[PDB]
Design a binder for this molecule. Sequence first.
Ligand SMILES: [Mg+2]
Ligand SMILES: [Mg+2]
Ligand SMILES: [Mg+2]
Ligand SMILES: [Mg+2]
Ligand SMILES: [Mg+2]
Ligand SMILES: [Mg+2]
Ligand SMILES: [Mg+2]
Ligand SMILES: [Mg+2]
Ligand SMILES: [Mg+2]
Ligand SMILES: [Mg+2]
Ligand SMILES: [Mg+2]
Ligand SMILES: [Mg+2]
Ligand SMILES: [Mg+2]
Ligand SMILES: [Mg+2]
Ligand SMILES: [Mg+2]
Ligand SMILES: [Mg+2]
Ligand SMILES: [Mg+2]
Ligand SMILES: [Mg+2]
Ligand SMILES: [Mg+2]
Ligand SMILES: [Mg+2]
Ligand SMILES: [Mg+2]
Ligand SMILES: [Mg+2]
Ligand SMILES: [Mg+2]
Ligand SMILES: [Mg+2]
Ligand SMILES: [Mg+2]
Ligand SMILES: [Mg+2]
Ligand SMILES: [Mg+2]
Ligand SMILES: [Mg+2]
Ligand SMILES: [Mg+2]
Ligand SMILES: [Mg+2]
Ligand SMILES: [Mg+2]
Ligand SMILES: [Mg+2]
Ligand SMILES: [Mg+2]
Ligand SMILES: [Mg+2]
Ligand SMILES: [Mg+2]
Ligand SMILES: [Mg+2]
Ligand SMILES: [Mg+2]
Ligand SMILES: [Mg+2]
Ligand SMILES: [Mg+2]
Ligand SMILES: [Mg+2]
Ligand SMILES: [Mg+2]
Ligand SMILES: [Mg+2]
Ligand SMILES: [Mg+2]
Ligand SMILES: [Mg+2]
Ligand SMILES: [Mg+2]
Ligand SMILES: [Mg+2]
Ligand SMILES: [Mg+2]
Ligand SMILES: [Mg+2]
Ligand SMILES: [Mg+2]
Ligand SMILES: [Mg+2]
Ligand SMILES: [Mg+2]
Ligand SMILES: [Mg+2]
Ligand SMILES: [Mg+2]
Ligand SMILES: [Mg+2]
Ligand SMILES: [Mg+2]
Ligand SMILES: [Mg+2]
Ligand SMILES: [Mg+2]
Ligand SMILES: [Mg+2]
Ligand SMILES: [Mg+2]
Ligand SMILES: [Mg+2]
Ligand SMILES: [Mg+2]
Ligand SMILES: [Mg+2]
Ligand SMILES: [Mg+2]
Ligand SMILES: [Mg+2]
Ligand SMILES: [Mg+2]
Ligand SMILES: [Mg+2]
Ligand SMILES: [Mg+2]
Ligand SMILES: [Mg+2]
Ligand SMILES: [Mg+2]
Ligand SMILES: [Mg+2]
Ligand SMILES: [Mg+2]
Ligand SMILES: [Mg+2]
Ligand SMILES: [Mg+2]
Ligand SMILES: [Mg+2]
Ligand SMILES: [Mg+2]
Ligand SMILES: [Mg+2]
Ligand SMILES: [Mg+2]
Ligand SMILES: [Mg+2]
Ligand SMILES: [Mg+2]
Ligand SMILES: [Mg+2]
Ligand SMILES: [Mg+2]
Ligand SMILES: [Mg+2]
Ligand SMILES: [Mg+2]
Ligand SMILES: [Mg+2]
Ligand SMILES: [Mg+2]
Ligand SMILES: [Mg+2]
Ligand SMILES: [Mg+2]
Ligand SMILES: [Mg+2]
Ligand SMILES: [Mg+2]
Ligand SMILES: [Mg+2]
Ligand SMILES: [Mg+2]
Ligand SMILES: [Mg+2]
Ligand SMILES: [Mg+2]
Ligand SMILES: [Mg+2]
Ligand SMILES: [Mg+2]
Ligand SMILES: [Mg+2]
Ligand SMILES: [Mg+2]
Ligand SMILES: [Mg+2]
Ligand SMILES: [Mg+2]
Ligand SMILES: [Mg+2]
Ligand SMILES: [Mg+2]
Ligand SMILES: [Mg+2]
Ligand SMILES: [Mg+2]
Ligand SMILES: [Mg+2]
Ligand SMILES: [Mg+2]
Ligand SMILES: [Mg+2]
Ligand SMILES: [Mg+2]
Ligand SMILES: [Mg+2]
Ligand SMILES: [Mg+2]
Ligand SMILES: [Mg+2]
Ligand SMILES: [Mg+2]
Ligand SMILES: [Mg+2]
Ligand SMILES: [Mg+2]
Ligand SMILES: [Mg+2]
Ligand SMILES: [Mg+2]
Ligand SMILES: [Mg+2]
Ligand SMILES: [Mg+2]
Ligand SMILES: [Mg+2]
Ligand SMILES: [Mg+2]
Ligand SMILES: [Mg+2]
Ligand SMILES: [Mg+2]
Ligand SMILES: [Mg+2]
Ligand SMILES: [Mg+2]
Ligand SMILES: [Mg+2]
Ligand SMILES: [Mg+2]
Ligand SMILES: [Mg+2]
Ligand SMILES: [Mg+2]
Ligand SMILES: [Mg+2]
Ligand SMILES: [Mg+2]
Ligand SMILES: [Mg+2]
Ligand SMILES: [Mg+2]
Ligand SMILES: [Mg+2]
Ligand SMILES: [Mg+2]
Ligand SMILES: [Mg+2]
Ligand SMILES: [Mg+2]
Ligand SMILES: [Mg+2]
Ligand SMILES: [Mg+2]
Ligand SMILES: [Mg+2]
Ligand SMILES: [Mg+2]
Ligand SMILES: [Mg+2]
Ligand SMILES: [Mg+2]
Ligand SMILES: [Mg+2]
Ligand SMILES: [Mg+2]
Ligand SMILES: [Mg+2]
Ligand SMILES: [Mg+2]
Ligand SMILES: [Mg+2]
Ligand SMILES: [Mg+2]
Ligand SMILES: [Mg+2]
Ligand SMILES: [Mg+2]
Ligand SMILES: [Mg+2]
Ligand SMILES: [Mg+2]
Ligand SMILES: [Mg+2]
Ligand SMILES: [Mg+2]
Ligand SMILES: [Mg+2]
Ligand SMILES: [Mg+2]
Ligand SMILES: [Mg+2]
Ligand SMILES: [Mg+2]
Ligand SMILES: [Mg+2]
Ligand SMILES: [Mg+2]
Ligand SMILES: [Mg+2]
Ligand SMILES: [Mg+2]
Ligand SMILES: [Mg+2]
Ligand SMILES: [Mg+2]
Ligand SMILES: [Mg+2]
Ligand SMILES: [Mg+2]
Ligand SMILES: [Mg+2]
Ligand SMILES: [Mg+2]
Ligand SMILES: [Mg+2]
Ligand SMILES: [Mg+2]
Ligand SMILES: [Mg+2]
Ligand SMILES: [Mg+2]
Ligand SMILES: [Mg+2]
Ligand SMILES: [Mg+2]
Ligand SMILES: [Mg+2]
Ligand SMILES: [Mg+2]
Ligand SMILES: [Mg+2]
Ligand SMILES: [Mg+2]
Ligand SMILES: [Mg+2]
Ligand SMILES: [Mg+2]
Ligand SMILES: [Mg+2]
Ligand SMILES: [Mg+2]
Ligand SMILES: [Mg+2]
Ligand SMILES: [Mg+2]
Ligand SMILES: [Mg+2]
Ligand SMILES: [Mg+2]
Ligand SMILES: [Mg+2]
Ligand SMILES: [Mg+2]
Ligand SMILES: [Mg+2]
Ligand SMILES: [Mg+2]
Ligand SMILES: [Mg+2]
Ligand SMILES: [Mg+2]
Ligand SMILES: [Mg+2]
Ligand SMILES: [Mg+2]
Ligand SMILES: [Mg+2]
Ligand SMILES: [Mg+2]
Ligand SMILES: [Mg+2]
Ligand SMILES: [Mg+2]
Ligand SMILES: [Mg+2]
Ligand SMILES: [Mg+2]
Ligand SMILES: [Mg+2]
Ligand SMILES: [Mg+2]
Ligand SMILES: [Mg+2]
Ligand SMILES: [Mg+2]
Ligand SMILES: [Mg+2]
Ligand SMILES: [Mg+2]
Ligand SMILES: [Mg+2]
Ligand SMILES: [Mg+2]
Ligand SMILES: [Mg+2]
Ligand SMILES: [Mg+2]
Ligand SMILES: [Mg+2]
Ligand SMILES: [Mg+2]
Ligand SMILES: [Zn+2]
Lengths: 122, 131, 63, 204, 59, 118
Amino acid sequence: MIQPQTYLEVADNTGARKIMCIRVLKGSNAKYATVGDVIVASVKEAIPRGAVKEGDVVKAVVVRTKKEIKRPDGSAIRFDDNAAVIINNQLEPRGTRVFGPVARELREKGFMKIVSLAPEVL
Amino acid sequence: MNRGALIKLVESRYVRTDLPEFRPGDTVRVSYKVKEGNRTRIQDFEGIVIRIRRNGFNTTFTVRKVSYGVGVERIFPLHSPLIQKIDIVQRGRARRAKLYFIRNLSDREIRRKLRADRKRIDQDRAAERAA
Amino acid sequence: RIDVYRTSGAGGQHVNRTESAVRITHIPTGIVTQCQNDRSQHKNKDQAMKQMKAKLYELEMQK
Amino acid sequence: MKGILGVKVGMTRIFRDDRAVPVTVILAGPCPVVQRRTPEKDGYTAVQLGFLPQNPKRVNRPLKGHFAKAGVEPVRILREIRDFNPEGDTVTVEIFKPGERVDVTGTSKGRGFAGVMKRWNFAGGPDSHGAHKIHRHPGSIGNRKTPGRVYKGKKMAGHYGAERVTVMNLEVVDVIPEENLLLVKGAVPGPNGGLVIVRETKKA
Amino acid sequence: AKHPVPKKKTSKARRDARRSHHALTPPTLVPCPECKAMKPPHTVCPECGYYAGRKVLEV
Amino acid sequence: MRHLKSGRKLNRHSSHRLALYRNQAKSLLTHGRITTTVPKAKELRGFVDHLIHLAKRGDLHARRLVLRDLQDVKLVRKLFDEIAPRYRDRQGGYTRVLKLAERRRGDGAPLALVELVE
RNA sequence: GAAUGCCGGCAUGAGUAACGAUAAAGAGGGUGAGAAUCCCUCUCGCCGUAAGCCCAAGGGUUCCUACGCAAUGGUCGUCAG
RNA sequence: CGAUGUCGGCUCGUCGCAUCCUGGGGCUGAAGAAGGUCCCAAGGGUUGGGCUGUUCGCCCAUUAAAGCGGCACGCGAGCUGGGUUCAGAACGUCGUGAGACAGUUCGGUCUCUAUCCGCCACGGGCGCAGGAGGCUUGAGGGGGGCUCUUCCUAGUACGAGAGGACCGGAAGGGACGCACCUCUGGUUUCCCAGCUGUCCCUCCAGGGGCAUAAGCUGGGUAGCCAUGUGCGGAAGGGAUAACCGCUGAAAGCAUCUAAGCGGGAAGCCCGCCCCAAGAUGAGGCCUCCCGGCAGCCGGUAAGGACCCGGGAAGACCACCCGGUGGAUGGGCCGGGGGUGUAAGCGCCGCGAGGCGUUGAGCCGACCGGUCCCAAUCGUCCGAGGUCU
Ligand SMILES: [Mg+2]
Ligand SMILES: [Mg+2]
Ligand SMILES: [Mg+2]
Ligand SMILES: [Mg+2]
Ligand SMILES: [Mg+2]
Ligand SMILES: [Mg+2]
Ligand SMILES: [Mg+2]
Ligand SMILES: [Mg+2]
Ligand SMILES: [Mg+2]
Ligand SMILES: [Mg+2]
Ligand SMILES: [Mg+2]
Ligand SMILES: [Mg+2]
Ligand SMILES: [Mg+2]
Ligand SMILES: [Mg+2]
Ligand SMILES: [Mg+2]
Ligand SMILES: [Mg+2]
Ligand SMILES: [Mg+2]
Ligand SMILES: [Mg+2]
Ligand SMILES: [Mg+2]
Ligand SMILES: [Mg+2]
Ligand SMILES: [Mg+2]
Ligand SMILES: [Mg+2]
Ligand SMILES: [Mg+2]
Ligand SMILES: [Mg+2]
Ligand SMILES: [Mg+2]
Ligand SMILES: [Mg+2]
Ligand SMILES: [Mg+2]
Ligand SMILES: [Mg+2]
Ligand SMILES: [Mg+2]
Ligand SMILES: [Mg+2]
Ligand SMILES: [Mg+2]
Ligand SMILES: [Mg+2]
Ligand SMILES: [Mg+2]
Ligand SMILES: [Mg+2]
Ligand SMILES: [Mg+2]
Ligand SMILES: [Mg+2]
Ligand SMILES: [Mg+2]
Ligand SMILES: [Mg+2]
Ligand SMILES: [Mg+2]
Ligand SMILES: [Mg+2]
Ligand SMILES: [Mg+2]
Ligand SMILES: [Mg+2]
Ligand SMILES: [Mg+2]
Ligand SMILES: [Mg+2]
Ligand SMILES: [Mg+2]
Ligand SMILES: [Mg+2]
Ligand SMILES: [Mg+2]
Ligand SMILES: [Mg+2]
Ligand SMILES: [Mg+2]
Ligand SMILES: [Mg+2]
Ligand SMILES: [Mg+2]
Ligand SMILES: [Mg+2]
Ligand SMILES: [Mg+2]
Ligand SMILES: [Mg+2]
Ligand SMILES: [Mg+2]
Ligand SMILES: [Mg+2]
Ligand SMILES: [Mg+2]
Ligand SMILES: [Mg+2]
Ligand SMILES: [Mg+2]
Ligand SMILES: [Mg+2]
Ligand SMILES: [Mg+2]
Ligand SMILES: [Mg+2]
Ligand SMILES: [Mg+2]
Ligand SMILES: [Mg+2]
Ligand SMILES: [Mg+2]
Ligand SMILES: [Mg+2]
Ligand SMILES: [Mg+2]
Ligand SMILES: [Mg+2]
Ligand SMILES: [Mg+2]
Ligand SMILES: [Mg+2]
Ligand SMILES: [Mg+2]
Ligand SMILES: [Mg+2]
Ligand SMILES: [Mg+2]
Ligand SMILES: [Mg+2]
Ligand SMILES: [Mg+2]
Ligand SMILES: [Mg+2]
Ligand SMILES: [Mg+2]
Ligand SMILES: [Mg+2]
Ligand SMILES: [Mg+2]
Ligand SMILES: [Mg+2]
Ligand SMILES: [Mg+2]
Ligand SMILES: [Mg+2]
Ligand SMILES: [Mg+2]
Ligand SMILES: [Mg+2]
Ligand SMILES: [Mg+2]
Ligand SMILES: [Mg+2]
Ligand SMILES: [Mg+2]
Ligand SMILES: [Mg+2]
Ligand SMILES: [Mg+2]
Ligand SMILES: [Mg+2]
Ligand SMILES: [Mg+2]
Ligand SMILES: [Mg+2]
Ligand SMILES: [Mg+2]
Ligand SMILES: [Mg+2]
Ligand SMILES: [Mg+2]
Ligand SMILES: [Mg+2]
Ligand SMILES: [Mg+2]
Ligand SMILES: [Mg+2]
Ligand SMILES: [Mg+2]
Ligand SMILES: [Mg+2]
Ligand SMILES: [Mg+2]
Ligand SMILES: [Mg+2]
Ligand SMILES: [Mg+2]
Ligand SMILES: [Mg+2]
Ligand SMILES: [Mg+2]
Ligand SMILES: [Mg+2]
Ligand SMILES: [Mg+2]
Ligand SMILES: [Mg+2]
Ligand SMILES: [Mg+2]
Ligand SMILES: [Mg+2]
Ligand SMILES: [Mg+2]
Ligand SMILES: [Mg+2]
Ligand SMILES: [Mg+2]
Ligand SMILES: [Mg+2]
Ligand SMILES: [Mg+2]
Ligand SMILES: [Mg+2]
Ligand SMILES: [Mg+2]
Ligand SMILES: [Mg+2]
Ligand SMILES: [Mg+2]
Ligand SMILES: [Mg+2]
Ligand SMILES: [Mg+2]
Ligand SMILES: [Mg+2]
Ligand SMILES: [Mg+2]
Ligand SMILES: [Mg+2]
Ligand SMILES: [Mg+2]
Ligand SMILES: [Mg+2]
Ligand SMILES: [Mg+2]
Ligand SMILES: [Mg+2]
Ligand SMILES: [Mg+2]
Ligand SMILES: [Mg+2]
Ligand SMILES: [Mg+2]
Ligand SMILES: [Mg+2]
Ligand SMILES: [Mg+2]
Ligand SMILES: [Mg+2]
Ligand SMILES: [Mg+2]
Ligand SMILES: [Mg+2]
Ligand SMILES: [Mg+2]
Ligand SMILES: [Mg+2]
Ligand SMILES: [Mg+2]
Ligand SMILES: [Mg+2]
Ligand SMILES: [Mg+2]
Ligand SMILES: [Mg+2]
Ligand SMILES: [Mg+2]
Ligand SMILES: [Mg+2]
Ligand SMILES: [Mg+2]
Ligand SMILES: [Mg+2]
Ligand SMILES: [Mg+2]
Ligand SMILES: [Mg+2]
Ligand SMILES: [Mg+2]
Ligand SMILES: [Mg+2]
Ligand SMILES: [Mg+2]
Ligand SMILES: [Mg+2]
Ligand SMILES: [Mg+2]
Ligand SMILES: [Mg+2]
Ligand SMILES: [Mg+2]
Ligand SMILES: [Mg+2]
Ligand SMILES: [Mg+2]
Ligand SMILES: [Mg+2]
Ligand SMILES: [Mg+2]
Ligand SMILES: [Mg+2]
Ligand SMILES: [Mg+2]
Ligand SMILES: [Mg+2]
Ligand SMILES: [Mg+2]
Ligand SMILES: [Mg+2]
Ligand SMILES: [Mg+2]
Ligand SMILES: [Mg+2]
Ligand SMILES: [Mg+2]
Ligand SMILES: [Mg+2]
Ligand SMILES: [Mg+2]
Ligand SMILES: [Mg+2]
Ligand SMILES: [Mg+2]
Ligand SMILES: [Mg+2]
Ligand SMILES: [Mg+2]
Ligand SMILES: [Mg+2]
Ligand SMILES: [Mg+2]
Ligand SMILES: [Mg+2]
Ligand SMILES: [Mg+2]
Ligand SMILES: [Mg+2]
Ligand SMILES: [Mg+2]
Ligand SMILES: [Mg+2]
Ligand SMILES: [Mg+2]
Ligand SMILES: [Mg+2]
Ligand SMILES: [Mg+2]
Ligand SMILES: [Mg+2]
Ligand SMILES: [Mg+2]
Ligand SMILES: [Mg+2]
Ligand SMILES: [Mg+2]
Ligand SMILES: [Mg+2]
Ligand SMILES: [Mg+2]
Ligand SMILES: [Mg+2]
Ligand SMILES: [Mg+2]
Ligand SMILES: [Mg+2]
Ligand SMILES: [Mg+2]
Ligand SMILES: [Mg+2]
Ligand SMILES: [Mg+2]
Ligand SMILES: [Mg+2]
Ligand SMILES: [Mg+2]
Ligand SMILES: [Mg+2]
Ligand SMILES: [Mg+2]
Ligand SMILES: [Mg+2]
Ligand SMILES: [Mg+2]
Ligand SMILES: [Mg+2]
Ligand SMILES: [Mg+2]
Ligand SMILES: [Mg+2]
Ligand SMILES: [Mg+2]
Ligand SMILES: [Mg+2]
Ligand SMILES: [Mg+2]
Ligand SMILES: [Mg+2]
Ligand SMILES: [Mg+2]
Ligand SMILES: [Mg+2]
Ligand SMILES: [Mg+2]
Ligand SMILES: [Zn+2]
């Protein structure tokens, strides 16, 4: 459950370290973003000389939530952080690596690059 | 009429008895059926069960692991048909039923608070002595 | 485009309850201008027409 | 336009095609028809169904005459399914097959005299910033001297629940005839043990 | 609030009219099968101390 | 809403209800029979019956359990030695409530008697 | 017949708000025409740099005892300043 | 003016249509896609945020769209009180001054009890010509009414290309609504455990009070819940709007019109869900009851009430179930469920402790069983059926 004001760890090597959601891009008034959804965010912390910098307005896909996501098989999964991967307008990851595990829902919503780059898909 | 027995009767046809018996604090490997593309495979997920949430056929557990630097935590229906098998990898002795508290502990600290349940380990090896 | 709204300071049940302040905005230029000095919106619409004349006399000067 | 009477027994979930599907279990059958409503006689077509056997010592004489004329044995509930005329003298869960899609009517749970936030999802008031004894209050209920009154149907506090509700287009997940059981996907109005009516859906 | 207040005096008619619901209902009494005294049903007889056909209470 | 909730409040907070039931149990078990209000009398039945049954079990653990509620060693001796054996073959239903005919003057409260059964 | 008139009486609101700290009560016995409210006993709770004890001011018989319950006591009252 | 409280906000709406979106349509300098403009259309919808007391406005990120107005610029006996509009103080300014400013600045008491109308809910009475127990019809009324994206058709029509369809299908969403608690996730005032201090029971051990109206902490069934689950917006039928026609005169031609006939909107009527015969126009069906003197008196019948045990019913009332020929509540028993291995004893350790007995003990509500306890015994109402 990500909404405006929520910080997320960024799980890539774009240089961003923390972003703040300012809008969940899912209809005219979606309250929450979960895994697989796209958000517009401000970059609140970044490492020197990254591809993105503090202040930039970026897009990202939520790869991990601390609120557990439910699956049709009756199981659920939950991670310790809220994490996103910064993308372009072709939903393509804007860095070269992604860190930590990502949820399998990303596959179903068309984030194939990110799913394959992930060290583990749960 | 006995509504409880009617429920239990509808459930009887999905109840599962082949899975091994485990307790909060034990370390468990769940071989879980998973669907991706274009196939289905079996994915193992192994960690400490921190919770068993009992309601007959509707009991569920929660298993916790650290996957490349991130805590991951899965909830399985005990009687799910997508569980191939469950393997007991270690018996831990906890002092309570719910182990939420290890979420906040280092691996050292967890490893000190959940020492091996030497009794039930001895039980496991007294069994698997097959005839 | 001339907007009309309430003043922002003293006045009483007036200022509250009367749309005396005007804002004239020249559309193609983006120049905005207000006036709240008097109590009538027409004193203010007058004054803001002056100030708006003079500001487009100052751009056409700056050109 | 088929239907049957029943009792809500409880909820669980089954597994179908690697999907956990939530179900409400209903004990529906068997229902004897104790009167038929004909256009001749009654102005419409319907069938009054009986359900749950009753101890005859609790059945008074006029009701006993009614049952006896049907050659039927005393029953706890009489409810009428409209535009339905089953061909036998007893209605069971056989009338529904899995995959069919049904409307379920029950008496919702009664919430007694309910506030405006619980009944009508009003926002209530602030819980700080000076808010004074109005944290769960409706706010304004009108205008001023025009119209100088309150609309009919104005949402206000009052009793809520314990009232007829129909939930429509529910999937029949399974039927178990040897127990007169009906597994419908989803939520059915009312408490466990409550009386319900299961009908063929009017949705296409 | 702003201290609401009756607009008019209630008439004798409207007063007594709301009071059309205030009459008491008499207590419901049955004879004691022992001493034949009247008492509330389902209570121990205060006159002879029996209930359910047996002495229960010093009276 | 109070759906399927068991137990009365008796306009007392938690500890005061608790002390209420304990004291009245002490009063029954001392006198074998008391007069109280009908609601309080109806609440006593279960909580005295538990203590009596536990006395019928007779072991040390039951004595300490009962003695959490009753506190009085002598009274608990009376419970195990003298009240309990009386109910060896009776399975529950160690108390009865019988409603009294007349109300309390000062507050109109309806009254009842609570007894240990024969 | 009126002066938001003056004095007095009696209405309406209304059997309604309220009965003055959320420290808390229960039972057995006694007395009595009458007892949740008075006395006695057991159990429970509260204060304890006080909600205990002593002095000064102020108050002025409120002290003790016997006999009483119309009124005073926010209920009751056999009790009491 | 013997008082009609005012700006902005919040809450709750409702109405208008000069329509922001969605639906239908004409013209286009309409190839397609996308626009422009005008007509029809008020059913539903019309986001979050930065600034400022602000309305307004600017800006950020979205969106199908981020509509404009009325309702005492709706709404302070509903809230707020930042702004204006008391007393304090200060700046600039004006005045010799006291003081003053549609100029600014910091601060500054917003009244427990609803009589009538109205509104939301719930009853009592009487009526509905005989009196009763059930089951219904639906006059009339209320609810609801939104929309996007992707894929197939088809990279086809069109187009130099870039782009890119009509019609017709499918899949998945956002917000809203109704219900529900199997799952997810809450609470769970005493259901279990652990802990400190103190006082006590009984010295040890084991326990109890209090530290909150749970002392604190870790957990937590039922119930009630959303963050969780199911389902709804329709389909379809009818009449229309703008608009498009067929046939067709007056007026040899022409004309959608004058006689006729057709097509046609998220809108209208039905359809779906809920209420509903006080619908005094009081409806219908099934079944039961059969003496004293258009009245009256008494005792009854069918039946109902009282009283009692209770209830996911409930403020009281009502409703529903049960009342010994009974499982209604309480106990007890079994199960579920929570907690997580009681006490006691034995063994190891100097000891705090540890190990075994032991998934032990304790154990609200959930699912059942069992007459052990309690619904004892009873009492009262209640037809004798108006005339053509
Ligand atoms: Mg990372
Ligand atoms: Mg910087
Ligand atoms: Mg159940
Ligand atoms: Mg069965
Ligand atoms: Mg692997
Ligand atoms: Mg681990
Ligand atoms: Mg398999
Ligand atoms: Mg201002
Ligand atoms: Mg104005
Ligand atoms: Mg004005
Ligand atoms: Mg199946
Ligand atoms: Mg029903
Ligand atoms: Mg209720
Ligand atoms: Mg409310
Ligand atoms: Mg609510
Ligand atoms: Mg609601
Ligand atoms: Mg709110
Ligand atoms: Mg606020
Ligand atoms: Mg709120
Ligand atoms: Mg205030
Ligand atoms: Mg408050
Ligand atoms: Mg209000
Ligand atoms: Mg006003
Ligand atoms: Mg007002
Ligand atoms: Mg009017
Ligand atoms: Mg109701
Ligand atoms: Mg239920
Ligand atoms: Mg107020
Ligand atoms: Mg007020
Ligand atoms: Mg008021
Ligand atoms: Mg106030
Ligand atoms: Mg007042
Ligand atoms: Mg008045
Ligand atoms: Mg009179
Ligand atoms: Mg009146
Ligand atoms: Mg006598
Ligand atoms: Mg409550
Ligand atoms: Mg109960
Ligand atoms: Mg209790
Ligand atoms: Mg209760
Ligand atoms: Mg009660
Ligand atoms: Mg209480
Ligand atoms: Mg009280
Ligand atoms: Mg009290
Ligand atoms: Mg409490
Ligand atoms: Mg306490
Ligand atoms: Mg206490
Ligand atoms: Mg019990
Ligand atoms: Mg009784
Ligand atoms: Mg009585
Ligand atoms: Mg008295
Ligand atoms: Mg005169
Ligand atoms: Mg006067
Ligand atoms: Mg006067
Ligand atoms: Mg006056
Ligand atoms: Mg006067
Ligand atoms: Mg006079
Ligand atoms: Mg006078
Ligand atoms: Mg006077
Ligand atoms: Mg009068
Ligand atoms: Mg008076
Ligand atoms: Mg009253
Ligand atoms: Mg009143
Ligand atoms: Mg009142
Ligand atoms: Mg009161
Ligand atoms: Mg008070
Ligand atoms: Mg008090
Ligand atoms: Mg006495
Ligand atoms: Mg006494
Ligand atoms: Mg007294
Ligand atoms: Mg007295
Ligand atoms: Mg007192
Ligand atoms: Mg005394
Ligand atoms: Mg103390
Ligand atoms: Mg001290
Ligand atoms: Mg002196
Ligand atoms: Mg004096
Ligand atoms: Mg004296
Ligand atoms: Mg004196
Ligand atoms: Mg003295
Ligand atoms: Mg004295
Ligand atoms: Mg004396
Ligand atoms: Mg006196
Ligand atoms: Mg007196
Ligand atoms: Mg007196
Ligand atoms: Mg005298
Ligand atoms: Mg007095
Ligand atoms: Mg008095
Ligand atoms: Mg006083
Ligand atoms: Mg005397
Ligand atoms: Mg005194
Ligand atoms: Mg005036
Ligand atoms: Mg006046
Ligand atoms: Mg006046
Ligand atoms: Mg006035
Ligand atoms: Mg006035
Ligand atoms: Mg409006
Ligand atoms: Mg128009
Ligand atoms: Mg349009
Ligand atoms: Mg259009
Ligand atoms: Mg086009
Ligand atoms: Mg073009
Ligand atoms: Mg157009
Ligand atoms: Mg036009
Ligand atoms: Mg037109
Ligand atoms: Mg509209
Ligand atoms: Mg409208
Ligand atoms: Mg509108
Ligand atoms: Mg906005
Ligand atoms: Mg800020
Ligand atoms: Mg703001
Ligand atoms: Mg603003
Ligand atoms: Mg601000
Ligand atoms: Mg402005
Ligand atoms: Mg500007
Ligand atoms: Mg867009
Ligand atoms: Mg558009
Ligand atoms: Mg307006
Ligand atoms: Mg105006
Ligand atoms: Mg306004
Ligand atoms: Mg206004
Ligand atoms: Mg206002
Ligand atoms: Mg106010
Ligand atoms: Mg205001
Ligand atoms: Mg007012
Ligand atoms: Mg008002
Ligand atoms: Mg007013
Ligand atoms: Mg404010
Ligand atoms: Mg102010
Ligand atoms: Mg200020
Ligand atoms: Mg001010
Ligand atoms: Mg001011
Ligand atoms: Mg002023
Ligand atoms: Mg001032
Ligand atoms: Mg001043
Ligand atoms: Mg200053
Ligand atoms: Mg100066
Ligand atoms: Mg000046
Ligand atoms: Mg001056
Ligand atoms: Mg000067
Ligand atoms: Mg000067
Ligand atoms: Mg000034
Ligand atoms: Mg200043
Ligand atoms: Mg201050
Ligand atoms: Mg000021
Ligand atoms: Mg206030
Ligand atoms: Mg006042
Ligand atoms: Mg009042
Ligand atoms: Mg009133
Ligand atoms: Mg009026
Ligand atoms: Mg009525
Ligand atoms: Mg009635
Ligand atoms: Mg109708
Ligand atoms: Mg009407
Ligand atoms: Mg309608
Ligand atoms: Mg294609
Ligand atoms: Mg081509
Ligand atoms: Mg299409
Ligand atoms: Mg849809
Ligand atoms: Mg449950
Ligand atoms: Mg739950
Ligand atoms: Mg659950
Ligand atoms: Mg849970
Ligand atoms: Mg729970
Ligand atoms: Mg306890
Ligand atoms: Mg001692
Ligand atoms: Mg000691
Ligand atoms: Mg000790
Ligand atoms: Mg202690
Ligand atoms: Mg103490
Ligand atoms: Mg305390
Ligand atoms: Mg405690
Ligand atoms: Mg602690
Ligand atoms: Mg918890
Ligand atoms: Mg807790
Ligand atoms: Mg939700
Ligand atoms: Mg939907
Ligand atoms: Mg033509
Ligand atoms: Mg033609
Ligand atoms: Mg014509
Ligand atoms: Mg046509
Ligand atoms: Mg036509
Ligand atoms: Mg055509
Ligand atoms: Mg048509
Ligand atoms: Mg639609
Ligand atoms: Mg109906
Ligand atoms: Mg009728
Ligand atoms: Mg009806
Ligand atoms: Mg009429
Ligand atoms: Mg009728
Ligand atoms: Mg009919
Ligand atoms: Mg009878
Ligand atoms: Mg009740
Ligand atoms: Mg009452
Ligand atoms: Mg009934
Ligand atoms: Mg009955
Ligand atoms: Mg009986
Ligand atoms: Mg009997
Ligand atoms: Mg029972
Ligand atoms: Mg039972
Ligand atoms: Mg049990
Ligand atoms: Mg169990
Ligand atoms: Mg268990
Ligand atoms: Mg042990
Ligand atoms: Mg032990
Ligand atoms: Mg030793
Ligand atoms: Mg050892
Ligand atoms: Mg058990
Ligand atoms: Mg039996
Ligand atoms: Mg019995
Ligand atoms: Mg009798
Ligand atoms: Zn008697």
